[PDB]
Amino acid sequence: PRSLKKGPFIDAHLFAKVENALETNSRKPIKTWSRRSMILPQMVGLTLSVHNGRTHVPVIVSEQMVGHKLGEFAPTRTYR
Amino acid sequence: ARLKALYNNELKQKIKEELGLDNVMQVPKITKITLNMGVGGASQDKKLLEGAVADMTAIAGQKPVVTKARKSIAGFKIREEWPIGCKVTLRGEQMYEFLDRLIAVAIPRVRDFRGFSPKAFDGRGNYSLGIKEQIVFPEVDFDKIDRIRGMDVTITTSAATDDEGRALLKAFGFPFK
Amino acid sequence: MRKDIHPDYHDVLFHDTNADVFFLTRSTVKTKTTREYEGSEYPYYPLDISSASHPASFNKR
Amino acid sequence: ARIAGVNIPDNKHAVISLTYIFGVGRTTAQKILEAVGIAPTTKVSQLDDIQLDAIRAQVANYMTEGDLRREVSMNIKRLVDLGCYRGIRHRR
RNA sequence: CCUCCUAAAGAGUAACGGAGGAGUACGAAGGUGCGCUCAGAACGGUCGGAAAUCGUUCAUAGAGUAUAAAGGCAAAAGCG
RNA sequence: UUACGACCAGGGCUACACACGUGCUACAAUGGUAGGUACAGAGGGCAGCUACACAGCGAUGUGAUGCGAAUCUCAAAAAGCCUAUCGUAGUCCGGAUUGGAGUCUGCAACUCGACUCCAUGAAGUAGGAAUCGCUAGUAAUCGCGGAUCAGAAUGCCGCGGUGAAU
Numbered sequence: 001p002r003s004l005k006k007g008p009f010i011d012a013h014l015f016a017k018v019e020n021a022l023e024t025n026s027r028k029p030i031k032t033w034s035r036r037s038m039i040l041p042q043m044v045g046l047t048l049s050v051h052n053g054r055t056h057v058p059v060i061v062s063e064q065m066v067g068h069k070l071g072e073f074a075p076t077r078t079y080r
Numbered sequence: 081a082r083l084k085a086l087y088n089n090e091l092k093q094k095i096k097e098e099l100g101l102d103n104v105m106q107v108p109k110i111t112k113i114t115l116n117m118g119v120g121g122a123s124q125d126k127k128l129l130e131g132a133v134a135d136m137t138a139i140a141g142q143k144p145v146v147t148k149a150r151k152s153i154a155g156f157k158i159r160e161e162w163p164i165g166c167k168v169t170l171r172g173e174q175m176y177e178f179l180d181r182l183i184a185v186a187i188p189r190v191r192d193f194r195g196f197s198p199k200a201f202d203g204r205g206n207y208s209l210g211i212k213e214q215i216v217f218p219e220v221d222f223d224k225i226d227r228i229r230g231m232d233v234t235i236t237t238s239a240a241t242d243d244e245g246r247a248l249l250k251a252f253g254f255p256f257k
Numbered sequence: 258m259r260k261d262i263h264p265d266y267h268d269v270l271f272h273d274t275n276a277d278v279f280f281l282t283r284s285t286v287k288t289k290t291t292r293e294y295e296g297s298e299y300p301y302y303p304l305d306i307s308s309a310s311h312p313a314s315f316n317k318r
Numbered sequence: 319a320r321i322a323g324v325n326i327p328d329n330k331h332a333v334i335s336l337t338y339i340f341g342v343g344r345t346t347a348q349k350i351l352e353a354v355g356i357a358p359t360t361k362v363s364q365l366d367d368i369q370l371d372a373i374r375a376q377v378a379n380y381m382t383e384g385d386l387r388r389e390v391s392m393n394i395k396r397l398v399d400l401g402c403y404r405g406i407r408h409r410r
Numbered sequence: 411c412c413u414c415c416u417a418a419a420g421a422g423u424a425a426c427g428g429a430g431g432a433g434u435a436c437g438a439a440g441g442u443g444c445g446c447u448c449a450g451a452a453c454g455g456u457c458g459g460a461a462a463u464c465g466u467u468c469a470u471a472g473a474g475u476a477u478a479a480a481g482g483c484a485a486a487a488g489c490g
Numbered sequence: 491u492u493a494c495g496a497c498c499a500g501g502g503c504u505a506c507a508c509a510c511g512u513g514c515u516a517c518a519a520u521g522g523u524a525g526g527u528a529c530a531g532a533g534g535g536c537a538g539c540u541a542c543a544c545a546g547c548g549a550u551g552u553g554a555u556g557c558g559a560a561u562c563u564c565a566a567a568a569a570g571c572c573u574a575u576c577g578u579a580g581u582c583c584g585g586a587u588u589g590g591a592g593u594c595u596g597c598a599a600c601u602c603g604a605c606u607c608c609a610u611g612a613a614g615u616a617g618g619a620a621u622c623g624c625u626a627g628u629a630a631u632c633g634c635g636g637a638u639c640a641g642a643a644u645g646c647c648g649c650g651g652u653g654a655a656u
Contacts, residue, residue: 004318033500036598041315053501066315071600072402077505116464141266141285156462165463177283184280185271188311191323192384202466208455219285222325230456234465275371303367305320334582390589
């Protein structure tokens, strides 16, 4: 996972996109490639478009998805 | 039976006041309690039925009766008049004692018991519950046991309505919800 | 009740020792010991449980 | 004996018999016996009723099978219904 | 040899006419006294479901009647 | 030859109806577990190893000391021996898989890290046809180092312990 002493990890470039989205209270899906950023309750409610290697699949963030990484809901491989 | 002597003094009038009934013959009462055991896998071994009858005898305190197949069904590999279950019916003192024992001692011994469904009445005040393991009754001992069996406990009451049946059951202290 | 076809049915003193509550009730059980209630000495049966004893994260870290 | 709603073996030692409870391993059983005050080398069969109920009260803290299975199944459900990667492998 | 139809509302009535059965069974499946009521559907209920056993409510018979069919069958001729 | 060359982010090389090749861990009593009590070699250490003290169940964290090392350290060797217990059970065997909570390394551990703790406890009770290595400090078994390496060995390369049968 990570170390609690280090603190939550969120990419600065996406954190800026949510500080320019929760003040505005827009519903525009923020298009992002950083799957390595953990969903915090700060942007709970809005929509992101996470790159899964091929496309920017939409992930509407919910209340019980905080603490997870953005990539957990953007599978990259297709079984069948 | 202490539960009969308690229902004849407190529970009857409490049920009347609760349901708002204008006649003492309207308040529900339990008429009988029937314990059943489908041993459909019998008539191939006929020792499972022996153990089921012994378990019913010890649980109820009353010699049960072997129930035969009313029809012939190939899917269950049963032919007419084949012993495929066990049943006992308790009335009056025996049923009041059994239900007191079941509510006090045995019903907390059900593994992972949160409650009993309140929508399990058939729609005429009678209740039915399933016991998945017959070891919750202290009468049967864990040392000597054939296997783990189950049992139906059907509580047939004089209530004509769903709500009256559950009010009567809850007046006894039945664990609901 | 037909005669001598039913099992022995005698009063038993069940006792929830956690809350220390007694339940006097006829039963088919044959207890090893016998403890006296306010009346006679009934076959005593201890009980582990009875009807008297049975019953964001991101911000924190 | 009968602890936590299950029939733990009687001829075993206490610290081994208590592991038969779904939710109690061997270190949790050791910690339970430390608090209760019974030697882990004593058979469950020769255990007094007062200390049997003390062990029951001590067990009532840890999330045993009745609550544990519910909580674990709902934990798995929280991922299965969420559609995340871990849940997508959980369902298959 | 038996049952239905042909067969024309008494009986009977033919065809290489249209359809099916019999050449047994049972010492109880006979006699009597006593007692009972079926099939299905819905609802509730451990394994247990479409359907086993249990409980409830509808239910002149939609069952059963050793067997083919017809006619009968509650005083049951059905079931103990 | 404004691309089959070049740069960057994300993903993949880690997917699994399956099959095979090399292994590791087991299926236990010649053993598991809990206490004590011994006996090595070789190699590494500033791109670091850490005495000791404290905190923590633990991985580890903080302070601090010695050492470019025959000086200080990794580091305790394990199998072994004594006592207790388990008493043949899918178990006090086995430790996969899963749930939860953490520690480190690293910009970053979702895809896709390694360890720690608690819970779970899967197959597995000796393996068909077939087939492999080994002639002595060998096989068998037991631990310990190193290269690569920020982190990531059950592989590779070595070291010693016990130690056969024919």
